[PDB]
Structure 1
Amino acid sequence: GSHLGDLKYSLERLREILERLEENPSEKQIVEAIRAIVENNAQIVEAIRAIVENNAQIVENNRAIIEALEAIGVDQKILEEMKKQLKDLKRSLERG
C-alpha cells in the first residue's frame, strides 16, 4: 500500500527543496522539486486508495455486527435504519 513515515519524511525534504528554489530559482531546483512531488504523489495516491478499501471492510464489518445484533433480538426498528445507511455508504466507497 503506502508507508506514511516515508511520505511525511519526503514531504519535509520537499519543503527544503522549495525553500532553496525560492531563494535561488533554477532549472535544477525546479526539476528536483517536481521529482520529490511525483514520488510523494505515488505514496499519496496509494494511501488514499488503500484507506477506501479498508473503509469498505469496516462498513462490511458493521453489516456483520448488524447481523450479530439481530441474532439476539435487537429491535429491527433500529437495525433496519443502519442497514440503509451501510448499504449506501458502501456504495460510495466502491469503484468500478
Structure 2
Amino acid sequence: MGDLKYSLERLREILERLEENPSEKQIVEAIRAIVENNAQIVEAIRAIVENNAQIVENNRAIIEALEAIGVDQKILEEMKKQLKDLKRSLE
C-alpha cells in the first residue's frame, strides 16, 4: 500500500518526464513503469483477498456465539420456571 503510492509516485514522474520531451524509449519506459505498478496492485489485491478470509471466520464465530446464546436463554427460561414453582411450593 505504501509501495503503491510510491510506485504511483514514480509513475507520475515518468509520465511528466514523457510529457515534457517525448521519445520512443521514454514511452517504453512508461509502459514498463505501468506494468510494475499493475504488478504491485495485483499483489495488494491478493493480500486483501487473503485478509478477507477473516470475514468468513468472524461470521462462523458469530453464528456459534448466537447458537450458544439461544441455548442459554432457553435454560434461563426453564430456570425462571423452576424458581416460581419452588417459591409457590414453599407458599
Q: TM-score, normalised by structure 2?
A: 0.68
- Deviation, 1:26, is 0.5
The 1:13–1:54 alpha-carbon spacing in structure 2 relative to 1, beyond 3 Å, is same
Q: Structure 1, residues 49-92: CA drift from partner, whole Å, max 9, x if none?
A: 22122223212211211111221118999999999999999999
Q: Which runs of 5+ in 2 are unaligned?
A: none
- Runs of 4+ in structure 1 displaced over 6 angstroms? 74-94
Give RMSD over aligned pairs.
Answer: 15.9
Which structure has the bigger radius of gyration?
Answer: 2
The 1:40–1:30 alpha-carbon spacing in structure 2 relative to 1, beyond 3 Å, is same
Equivalent residue number for residue 48 of structure 1: 45
State the aligned residue count. Answer: 91
Identify the structure with bigger relative contact order (alpha carbons < 8 Å, sequence gap 6+).
1
Is contact 1:11–1:40 with CA below 8 Å preserved after alignment? Answer: yes
Q: Which runs of 5+ in 1 are unaligned?
A: none
Q: Structure 1, residues 1-41: CA drift from partner, whole Å, max 9, x if none?
A: xxx11221011111011111112110121121111111111
The 1:51–1:13 alpha-carbon spacing in structure 2 relative to 1, beyond 3 Å, is same
Q: Percent identity?
A: 99
